[PDB]
């Protein structure tokens, strides 16, 4: 260790930045975020500085560097393109024992600016002393994905609870467990973020009433079409705190490889049975994640699985996912809309009735068929027997977003035979947008 | 942010600790190993202080607080159990603009001391600013079993190569591509952890020899509808490593806080073709450009128009899909887009009226579908009249979702004869959902009311 990390309180403390370019502007936005009383001294300023000044948010000293601007300063940052001026800044700062950063030169100054993950009042700082800015940014990117966006509001609210928790929990280890379920209750977190104070002390009273051991809830999490990188940040965070993950065939191996190490897995690849599995594994008092392919509310039966938790008292929440249409669209180079090609996008299945074929053949649509292969020969002639132009571009996307995605494409008179070249899970896309794939194909065809 | 973390260079710089017991000893060990010139001022001391002075590690001043001992100091720590003395020390340090910690009073004074995960020379610092010491500790634990122990040898080796890297690579973009490959090479990390120097050199020399691709790239990234948690892992990865982010008014501020702090940001908020060339000209300067778009880039996003010039131009590009507004607003309002058999199909429609076209209303009025109008607010009264006149029943439930997934989300709902009225009560950005699924809202609404 050759740097000591400290967390400085800068609110209304005099700080100085020397420089007025893009680099200084980024440091000024950091110091403004911390509430510093900011003076910025430069030969000239880019417009973002004069707008900041015209709003009373900092002070501008236009002109050469003047040492006396350090007279009552706590922090100094040299952010000019001129090594000579930066060296005069840092020398003037060192003889005044003002900690100083030189943006181009981390070893030439008395402090180094770390990568910051901001969950105020909780904060994480990562640095390797200027030996590795890229590693720092990589660790920041990781920490940013693991730390829920509203953890800071739980942190702030916990401090307003330290009393009421010791008064009802007289054991160290008992209180260690109350905080442990308190800080991962992200319903309470979102409840605080939304300023829905009826639902806060509702969740709060639940945290003191129910036993410590019981933290029961169900989260519907959309896994996306397969590529593990298409899981949402919130999805990952829920999967990392789950006591039990209920998943099915359509959730990819890559996503499951992200599940908590010490989490129980239930594989369910009849629909009524899945509903019961969710309920009383949540009535066991366990934090349950129901992982589903794509988006849980688009042909996922997510509606059916939650309504069982309704008259049952089990709290739930829903993390949306990248539906198959969106993923296959991006990864095949076929936009679902484009200029005037399509006034609407149609997400359609292929039980409970029969399809309206006149409707689907109407012009200016992008049609996206889910679960359609078993009717792909039927779809073909039924569309051209209801007016659809026989040359309509058509494409099929199998295992979209995955490392084994296959895209076969062509024209509506070939949909039947093209459909034999692909297996479930596949998507059928019909509309002029298909013809754009020749310009926008960037992913690998297998 | 209520604190600014900084990593201070304490070598040969004067620091003062007031107080002489166990809490002071723990802070003094931290400052000795940071390399500081340490003076300790206390009425009473414990053993390790008096050996350290005999061992020449520090200077002891036995007696009451002496504020003149701060005259040359850069940092001060008040670590007595007497809160009156601690306050004198912090008042004396403040008047000299010396950052000061009062150990038992995190909310007072001017810097707090974080808990540290040490990888030498990598370091992660974490604090809740005293507001919740328990959360800090649980987070330390997760970060620990997340940062591999030998990350420090990789970081230490990077620092030894930095002068070689700055010489052989002229531009900063090629230096970045070297580091990105460098920090993800698992064989290099394991060869370092073995002091296997022939293996470290074989891989290092191959890494320097790799002809670096010099083109830039354009990445369309779907921000999702607003909640920063609905950004994808890959979308976060692209903006955490971008050079320039070109972003909309419909990208939320929370997502903009996820953008690489050292990337610059071009705003384009309400020209479709100045955007196309801003991307092109900024890309093949050699830099990674992220075009960050609200929702999903290929659903009413004109993402196709932005990419179509690049292929014939020789510019690589990719697309990261996002959570389209229909999905986000469905999940966050408790209105599933499909359910059992309420809906055979979902229709995402542009409620905008291109100055020449008109929607096909008989088509949209059909039964057993969920209609979702994008940018349809200012024509909501026309949508009401047209759907009704083409056969949709008057009691069809509708909902308008404004700022869906944000903490400012509002949802108003009713039947189709209210749609025109209901739209007067929200502003953009808002979605219109028409269909039987809207009635499920009272059974599936988890997010809030507002
Ligand atoms: N990775 C993928 N590639 C292509 N189609 C997929 C897919 N994943 C799911 N699908 C489509 O979705 C159907 C399952 S229905 C479940 C859909 C899921 N809730 C979603 O939002 O995507 C499959 O028959 C297939 O047509
Ligand atoms: N957070 C939000 N809540 C409700 N509607 C939203 C929204 N964000 C975008 N929209 C809708 O989207 C329209 C812009 S069109 C761009 C949509 C984006 N490409 C996507 O896939 O979602 C707006 O007029 C509004 O109708
Ligand atoms: Cl670093
Ligand atoms: Cl478009």
Author numbering:
A (entry chain B): 1 to 269, 278 to 358, 362 to 457
B (entry chain A): 1 to 270, 278 to 457
List passages from the publication reporting this PDB structure.
Siroheme is the modified isobacteriochlorin tetrapyrrole used by siroheme-dependent sulfite and nitrite reductases (SiR/NiRs) in catalyzing the six-electron reduction of sulfite to sulfide or nitrite to ammonia. The N-terminal enzyme module, CysGB, is a three-domain bifunctional dehydrogenase/ATP-independent class III ferrochelatase12 that performs the final two steps of siroheme biosynthesis. The C-terminal enzyme module, CysGA, is homologous to a well-studied class of SAM-dependent uro’gen III methyltransferases (SUMTs) that catalyzes the methylations to generate precorrin-210,13.
We attempted to trap the co-sirohydrochlorin product by co-soaking sirohydrochlorin and cobalt. The resulting structure was lower resolution than the other structures and the closed active site that bound precorrin-2 and sirohydrochlorin showed no additional density. The open active site, however, contained a large, flat density that we interpreted as corresponding to a loosely bound product, sitting nearly perpendicularly to the position of the intermediates in the closed active site. Co-sirohydrochlorin was not bound deeply in the open cavity so its density was more diffuse than that for the other tetrapyrroles, but sufficient to assign the central plane of the tetrapyrrole as nearly orthogonal to precorrin-2 and sirohydrochlorin. Then, once metal is inserted, there would be steric overlap between the metal and P133, leading to product release, as captured in the weakly bound co-sirohydrochlorin. Given the differences between the binding poses of the unmetallated precorrin-2/sirohydrochlorin and the metallated tetrapyrrole, we propose a mechanism for product release: steric clash between the metal and the P133 platform induce the tetrapyrrole to break its extensive interactions with the binding pocket, allowing movement of helix 6 so the product can diffuse out of the active site.
